[PDB]
Write a protein that binds this ligand. Sequence first.
Ligand SMILES: *[C@@H]1O[C@H](CO)[C@@H](O)[C@H](O)[C@H]1NC(C)=O
Ligand SMILES: *[C@@H]1O[C@H](CO)[C@@H](O)[C@H](O)[C@H]1NC(C)=O
Lengths: 264, 100, 276, 8
Amino acid sequence: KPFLSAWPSAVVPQGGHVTLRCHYRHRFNNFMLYKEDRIHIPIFHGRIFQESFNMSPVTTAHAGNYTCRGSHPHSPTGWSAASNPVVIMVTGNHRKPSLLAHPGPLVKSGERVILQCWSDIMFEHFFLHKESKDPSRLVGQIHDGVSKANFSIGPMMFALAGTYRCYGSVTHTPYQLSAPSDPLDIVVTGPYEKPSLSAQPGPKVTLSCSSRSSYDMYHLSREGGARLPAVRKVNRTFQADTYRCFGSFRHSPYEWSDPSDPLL
Amino acid sequence: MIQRTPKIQVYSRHPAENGKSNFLNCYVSGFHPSDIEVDLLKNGERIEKVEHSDLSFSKDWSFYLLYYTEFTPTEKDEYACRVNHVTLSQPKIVKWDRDM
Amino acid sequence: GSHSMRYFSTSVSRPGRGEPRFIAVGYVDDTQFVRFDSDAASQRMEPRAPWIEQEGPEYWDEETGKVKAHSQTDRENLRIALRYYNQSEAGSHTLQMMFGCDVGSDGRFLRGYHQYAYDGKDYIALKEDLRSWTAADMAAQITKRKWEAAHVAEQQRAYLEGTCVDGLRRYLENGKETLQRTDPPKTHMTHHPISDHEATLRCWALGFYPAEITLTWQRDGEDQTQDTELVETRPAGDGTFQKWAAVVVPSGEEQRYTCHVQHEGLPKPLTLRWEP
Amino acid sequence: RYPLTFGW
Ligand SMILES: *[C@@H]1O[C@H](CO)[C@@H](O)[C@H](O)[C@H]1NC(C)=O
Ligand SMILES: *[C@@H]1O[C@H](CO)[C@@H](O)[C@H](O)[C@H]1NC(C)=O
């Protein structure tokens, strides 16, 4: 069977750019595309795509469930078999929903977190996507005049941490998603060792978290939500410049250390 | 990038006895990356039911595979192995030398 | 004798050609016993040797869990490497991991390995002390610092000396008549005229296990370590191995050369001389 | 027995 892929993503905004590539016989050879409504009927009047199909500018009719077939001339049928299904979902249709983290975006390694996607609009389908494979889906539950969902994410690992967005679809146009909800960054704490917290001149202000581990960046937060690069001291210690602080490594911004001890 | 060319060895499992069922092996080794194309040829034509071992490598990180098939050696039926790789612009044919 | 257990894992990314592929194989000495393919239908740690099929379902559930966790882990490590070397997200790259341990005839730990490689080059390796890491390039020093911060070398040391060698002893026991049974090499010699003034002598060794064997050509006693041609020890396909060594001899001096074969299954090394 | 692997 051929391999069908979408570059840069199968979740593309309207007017953006998307491209379906059909790999068969170790080549992006000539292929014909198909939708789920017409399984054995090629789309575009049986168009034979020489190169790859760039669907830019991406419109509404450009969404749906696709499968390709490559040209196998030396075979009973003139073409190949059915490739893997690929669902193109176009975003930017309805109004954006909302995304909250319960209990919070700072998840302990191996623990769970509920990303609740909700909106006053009674979206029938809610979809959760991390900023890069097939997105998750749950049906909206109507309560108190708004539709909500409970996406469970866990157990927490470095691969599950990142920027999440959630979308909503209407009951009769599932491939046309709403605008992207505001991006929620979910970061993981640990298993890296917790640092030590200090705040010259004293608790009566400048951050100062110290640790032997060469954390590239110290992050600070208090009980109420309201970066800081580091440098080594003469003791080779990497210091910074209810409170808590975490250590983080460069190019790995969504993976933090264990929380430092809380300080007055 | 490190791109090594596969070393090919075509041979028989047991000592070759004409007319006695046996196995033909093409051992490809030392290659990188792991994307390699190996087929067993009989009179130039591809052989079906060619099994392959599971992808593994050695202490220098170069991969190695074995492709084997059942056959019955005949003096008029000459067997061989075709190996194509990213380091090979031309599928290497290595003929199975019984007299070797 | 000195036995070993190894695990080799390969993660490859094929943008546009397929999904990322994770193949893992487990070997004891030279006999493969497990495999896991992220592209097969089972999605479970599969047996590849008869002496391991006798394990309970708890074993296969535990092993499948750990190997699928490693699948997801290395699949993500590919993406992290993309940013470590600032590589394009359209190229194809490789990530290999070699893990394992050695034991002696005493059944006690000898040496433990836990090393990684990116695109065939060394990445991060575990030192024989089992307490520090060797990072090859800068991207590997990043991982080394993360790993020193997570105290991973301590957990790996516990595992290499604990479950790894205990499991290796159990594997050597469950197939004692398979893994601790040496097979002697069957030897013969072939003669092919290279030209009128020289010919080629080839000493063969077939059907031997383990794959460790020594073929040396000697002219009047002294070795021809540089005049000889060696091929890689190749598998027969049935757990035995093959190898041959060939040296070019002047026409008439075939009696001056001889081939010595040394192997564990041989009670005494074999001397082979070619006669017409 | 399969090892315990960690993220890079
Ligand atoms: C897309 O179509 C294929 C082929 O009919 C089907 O198997 C697959 O489930 C569809 N994808 C969905 C429903 O997400
Ligand atoms: C969803 O998660 C919220 C988080 O507080 C919880 O209160 C609620 O019971 C869960 N279920 C529904 C149906 O909202």
